[PDB]
Amino acid sequence: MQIFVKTLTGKTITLEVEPSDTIENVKAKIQDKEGIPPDQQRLIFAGKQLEDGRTLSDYNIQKESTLHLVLRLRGG
Amino acid sequence: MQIFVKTLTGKTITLEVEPSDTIENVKAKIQDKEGIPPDQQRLIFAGCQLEDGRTLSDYNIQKESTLHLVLRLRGG
């Protein structure tokens, strides 16, 4: 299924995901496409930060859902 | 100075802050106004999560800047 991943800075990523994908697996897909290390990524749905070991299914993420991506950078 | 704090769910909070305020002190102001515990709050500027012990000055937060607020909820 297609989901959108949007930064708060004006970039939309489209991903093909499975409902059984963990949030960490989605971060790996974002690294594959955009080169951002999973350790720096924080994914958000419905205003809440998502936990790495839960699945898209666990969070009721449906086709065409939008996740937001923000970074946790150690340097800044 | 005035800043905006916006959720990703359609709520804008206006705060009066000082540039020497820590990010934790801003979370305390959000708790005072909205009743959200600081421990659940994550504040974001320019697509990056902000660190509790740094100041608005440290992050170049200017008058009329917008921070985003997301929650880290242990249960959901």
Numbering used by the authors:
A (entry chain B), B (entry chain A): 1 to 76
Text taken from the publication that reported this structure:
Ub is a small protein comprising 76 amino acid residues, which can be enzymatically connected to various proteins, including other Ub molecules, through (iso)peptide linkages, giving rise to biological messages, so-called “Ub codes”, which are read out by specific Ub-interacting proteins. In contrast, our prior NMR studies revealed that, in the major conformational state of Lys48-linked di-Ub (hereafter simply referred to as diUb), the hydrophobic surfaces are exposed to the solvent and open for the interactions with Ub-interacting proteins.
We found that the hydrophobic Ub-Ub interaction in diUb was reinforced by cysteine substitution of Lys48 of the distal Ub unit because of interaction between the cysteinyl thiol group and the C-terminal segment of the proximal Ub unit. Thus, we evaluated the possible effects of the substitution of Lys48 of the distal Ub unit on the proportions of open and closed states of diUb. We chose cysteine as a replacement for the Lys48 residue following the previous studies. The HSQC spectral data showed that the Val70 peak position of K48C-diUb was quite close to that of c-diUb, implying that this replacement substantially increased the proportion of closed states (56% at 25 °C, pH 7.0). This implies that the positive charge of Lys48 of the distal Ub unit destabilizes the closed conformation. We identified the crystal structure of K48C-diUb, which closely resembled the previously reported NMR structure of c-diUb. The increased proportion of the closed state of K48C-diUb was further elevated by C-terminal extension of the proximal Ub with a hexahistidine tag but was counteracted by carboxymethylation (CM) of the substituting cysteine, i.e., Cys48 of the distal Ub unit (K48CCM-diUb), although the C-terminal extension did not impact the proportion of the closed state in wild-type diUb.
